[PDB]
């Protein structure tokens, strides 16, 4: 945590805590200027708690004195920490006004509310008068700037502790916190600026959880040497589809092709295999003869033979979920000595004992409902639960890609968060594309974790490049947008 | 001085000196980013003295660590003040490299030199190894950023103390110092940024010497009410010219007209008076009958009658300097009960006893040669000598406008510095225009000091609006440019 980074910076590096606090508060002023333009016509109401968050607020208020139209601090705490006390003293010595009672009508006389009530030191549900003030601020229609984290968000989880400030702009220090990255906190944060307030760069970099960035993805993209052939860019087998679900194979296959894979083969029950090549004749779509339209143990041997000539196998989209599919999937994965990308119905039938026995790598790509069924918990217990994702990945020796508006990618040691995308991906087919992308990057030589990092980012970013309203985005359009997302990274 | 502003801010307001020092150094980083763009490709050499200037330099260096290509500090002092010592310690704790010997070839390995050797604490001529280092830096062709003031400029006078750093960018704190404003220091400062580092606004405003700004001049410009007539905008008499110097009256008269004066009358020896109206027929140019082409006591009575119907009288441009002119000028000014603008040859013959006896106001507009003769000192002793200008103004109850590339305007209590203009004003005629402008603004209701402040600014700014090379600017073109300077203020 940053709490540890702050401590080391003070205690071992010797930076006075007052210096960190001064830099935090001025960062806020500068961030506000960048967003609002010239500050001199605005009236500011600064809401300060008794903690260091409030101390940062007193620095903000003091630095606006004499330079803006009006500043008032409402001090809502009981006691003040030493740095909040020093800053409160400075604010008054500089001629600043403080009141200790919040009058509902006070909001009327101000244009900008600076929320410095609670930061990362929030413990427990917000109730009582703190809650009424926060509710009044949220109904007020004023511009809200939150110091560090919107008051009421738990900065380790992104949960709302009964009530929380909804900010237009949040200015945080050193690094983004998990509560800015996961929802609902991500929503309540609004526009986030991360300010450098003087921590050693080595400490800021010792953080083990990361937001996936454009620069990270650009540096991970495989090379395309000019003297290459399709074998240079790998081969994917996708085991997918059924008489019920004939579209999934096509979306996965093209997902691998659009990210630059050399060769993609689908194994799909006949005659549903013919659907793929009618749409995209660049795909190889092998007919699998099945008894009743679903994979079963009768197809195990043919699928293992098909897998010998490829670099990676993706399995699960549209397979259906019955006992014969369960038998096939688990026996297949137990025997397959290739990296596996495991999605959708292959997750629903997965025996997790099988993952532990595999010598070869795997990536699992569940949404929360699938993760919930996989570990036998409720959706609410697994959703955005990055520590559970980490334990699972570590215990099962896999990469886990837990899908949601913020996607978590972890191998148990490193955890990345993806924030690209929009609600046009909340539609059948989206996931099938991502499965193909991941398999494809693995085929091109990226590690399972690297492949997953690059794929979640580009999948979300392609969605944002859709030119019309996001709710009309479909998987087919997403596929079209992938090479543009790639070009825009570079 | 800012030294006093710093002291009060620490001792009475309670701001830790370390906080001021941190804000100073970060201001420098941000100013450099604004000028250089992204800092991450540059290598920085930071030259730190043992004083607080050097301490600011250690803050700069520390804040570049891990974020730019390379940083090295050469520490050139002997001992360190407490804040320089604290900062030096921080720079090393953060992993920064310091060396204490300056190797001439070291300049080769860096792109930007940060000059934090001496600030406002400079005492005496720079010699020895400090001088060699400064001379090496000046020959190096690198980008030079000076902290507070370029090392070697006396911050109270703008003089070079034997040798001084020539900066591309100077970042100073709180307010500009006199040494940034007066030459040579103004030249060596290069581009100046003034950073707010947290002093109370009340202290920053208790400064009694000021740079004349666009906003100040805009707020001083007289109103032009729609229901007005020429009498609304005042009347000027200009007593000027001689058989030798027939152009000066014309330039002064039009200077009053271009700034918005309602009526302008010249009193000029016949037939030289006819020169004015041949060029600008809007002028009234009264013929004065003289014995030999110069004003004398024989014209005293006519000039006093002419002055009864005006608001202000300007006297001196092109009068010539002989005994009869001296008699006339001094007897005239002794008797004239109107504001007087006194320039050129009227200064050269002025008896300063006369100024003390006048009940009415005066403004004097000498260049340094004229000021030197007026107080019987050398040009070198009076040039940029704002304290002597102040004493003179105070002792003689006048406004003194001491002309030079930076013009000083003072009434003895308030002193303003003008920095608009260019070398196209270093040419016969320029001064005659300014005399007219000042008279004109007085006629329109500005105080002598206000009139002088507005006129020096607009005169310099008109010169900068000349569209071709400044060396070809002439007074006639300057006159043409005045209404454009006025429009651009608004």
């Amino acid at each position: 945590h940053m709490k540890e980074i702050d401590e080391l910076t003070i205690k071992e590096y010797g930076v006075d805590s007052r210096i960190l606090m001064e830099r935090a508060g001025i960062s806020v002023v500068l961030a506000m200027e960048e967003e609002l333009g010239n500050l001199s016509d605005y009236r500011f109401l600064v809401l300060c708690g008794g903690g260091n968050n409030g101390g940062d607020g007193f620095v903000v208020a003091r630095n606006l004195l004499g330079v803006v139209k009006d500043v008032l601090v409402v001090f809502l705490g009981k006691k003040k920490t030493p740095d909040c006390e020093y800053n409160y003293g400075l604010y008054k010595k500089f001629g600043g006004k403080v009141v200790e009672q919040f009058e509902p009508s006070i909001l009327n006389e101000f244009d900008v509310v600076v929320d410095a009530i609670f930061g990362t030191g929030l413990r427990g549900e917000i109730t009582g008068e703190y809650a009424e003030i926060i509710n009044l601020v949220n109904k007020s229609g004023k511009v809200v700037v939150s110091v560090d984290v919107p008051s009421g968000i738990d900065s380790n989880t992104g949960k709302v502790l009964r009530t929380a400030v909804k900010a237009d702009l949040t200015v945080t220090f050193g690094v983004p916190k998990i509560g800015h990255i996961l929802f609902p906190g991500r929503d309540l944060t609004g526009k986030l600026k991360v300010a450098n307030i003087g921590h050693p760069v080595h400490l800021i970099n010792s953080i083990n959880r990361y937001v996936i960035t454009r620069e990270m993805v650009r540096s991970l993209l495989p090379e395309r040497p000019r003297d290459s052939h399709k074998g240079t860019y790998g081969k994917v087998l996708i085991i997918a589809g059924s008489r019920l679900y004939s579209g999934a194979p096509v979306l996965s296959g093209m997902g691998s092709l659009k990210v630059g894979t050399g060769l993609v083969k689908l194994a799909v029950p006949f005659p549903q295999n013919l659907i793929a090549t009618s749409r995209f004749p660049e795909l190889i779509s092998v007919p699998i003869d099945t008894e009743k339209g679903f994979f079963s143990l009768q197809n195990l041997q043919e699928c293992l033979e098909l897998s010998k000539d490829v670099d990676v196998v993706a399995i699960g989209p549209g397979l259906g979920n019955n006992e014969h599919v369960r038998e096939f999937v688990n026996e297949f994965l137990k025997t397959l000595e290739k990296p596996a990308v495991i999605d959708a119905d292959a997750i629903n039938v997965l025996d997790t004992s099988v993952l532990k026995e595999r010598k070869s790598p795997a990536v699992l790509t569940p949404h929360p409902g699938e993760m919930a069924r996989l570990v036998k918990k409720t959706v609410g217990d697994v959703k955005y639960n990055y520590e559970l994702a980490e334990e699972f990945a570590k215990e099962n020796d896999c990469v886990l890609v837990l899908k949601s508006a913020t996607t978590i990618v972890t191998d148990g040691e490193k955890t990345l968060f993806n924030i690209t995308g929009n609600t046009g991906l909340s539609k059948g087919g989206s996931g099938d594309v991502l499965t193909g992308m991941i398999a494809g990057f693995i085929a091109q030589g990226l590690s399972p974790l690297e492949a997953s990092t690059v794929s979640v980012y580009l999948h979300g970013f392609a969605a944002e490049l859709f030119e019309q309203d996001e709710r009309g985005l479909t998987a087919s359009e997403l596929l079209r947008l992938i090479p543009e997302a790639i070009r825009r990274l570079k | 001085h800012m030294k006093e502003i710093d002291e009060l801010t620490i001792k009475e307001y309670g701001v830790d000196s370390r906080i001021l020092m941190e804000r100073a150094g970060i201001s420098v980083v941000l100013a450099m980013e604004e000028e250089l763009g992204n800092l991450s490709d540059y290598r920085f050499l930071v030259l730190c003295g043992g004083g607080n200037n050097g301490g600011d330099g250690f803050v700069v260096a520390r804040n570049l660590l891990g974020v730019v290509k390379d940083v090295l500090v050469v520490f050139l002092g002997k001992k360190k003040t407490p804040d320089c010592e604290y900062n030096y310690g921080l720079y090393k704790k953060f992993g920064g490299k310091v060396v204490e010997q300056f190797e001439p070839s070291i300049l080769n390995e860096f792109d930007v030199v940060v000059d934090a050797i001496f600030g406002t604490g400079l005492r005496g001529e720079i010699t020895g190894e400090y001088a060699e280092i400064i001379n090496l830096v000046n020959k190096s062709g690198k980008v030079v950023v000076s902290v507070d003031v370029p090392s070697g400029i006396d911050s109270n006078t703008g003089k070079v103390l034997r040798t001084a750093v020539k900066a591309d960018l100077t970042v100073t704190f709180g307010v500009p110092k006199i040494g940034h404003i007066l030459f040579p220091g103004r030249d060596l400062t290069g581009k100046l940024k003034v950073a707010n580092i947290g002093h109370p606004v009340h202290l920053i405003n208790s400064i009694n010497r000021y740079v004349i700004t666009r906003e100040m001049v805009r707020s001083l410009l007289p109103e032009r009410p729609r229901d007005s007539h020429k009498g609304t905008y005042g009347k000027v008499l200009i007593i000027a010219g001689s058989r030798l110097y027939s152009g000066a009256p014309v330039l002064s008269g039009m200077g009053s007209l271009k700034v918005g004066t309602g009526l302008v009358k010249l009193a000029v020896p016949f037939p030289q008076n006819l020169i004015a109206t041949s060029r600008f027929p809007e002028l009234i140019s009264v013929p004065i009958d003289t014995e030999k082409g110069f004003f004398s006591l024989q014209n005293l009575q006519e000039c006093l009658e002419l002055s009864k119907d005006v608001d202000v009288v300007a006297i001196g441009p092109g009068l010539g300097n002989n005994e009869h002119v001296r008699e006339f000028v001094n007897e005239f000014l002794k008797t004239l009960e109107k504001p007087a603008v006194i320039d050129a040859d009227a200064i050269n013959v002025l008896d300063t006893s006369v100024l003390k006896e006048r009940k009415s106001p005066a403004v004097l507009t000498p260049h340094p040669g004229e000021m030197a003769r007026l107080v019987k000192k050398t040009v070198g002793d009076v040039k940029y000598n704002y304290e002597l200008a102040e004493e003179f103004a105070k002792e003689n109850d006048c406004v003194l406008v001491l002309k030079s590339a930076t013009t000083i305007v003072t009434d003895g209590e308030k002193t303003l510095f003008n920095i608009t203009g260019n070398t196209g004003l270093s040419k016969g005629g320029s001064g005659d225009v300014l005399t007219g402008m000042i008279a004109g603004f007085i006629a329109q209701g500005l105080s002598p000091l206000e009139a002088s402040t507005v006129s020096v600014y607009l005169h310099g700014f008109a010169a900068e609006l000349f569209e071709q090379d400044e060396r070809g600017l002439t007074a006639s073109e300057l006159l043409r440019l005045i209404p454009e300077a006025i429009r651009r203020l608004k």
Partner: peptide
Amino acid sequence: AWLFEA
């Protein structure tokens, strides 16, 4: 970029 990441 010295002060803020976006």
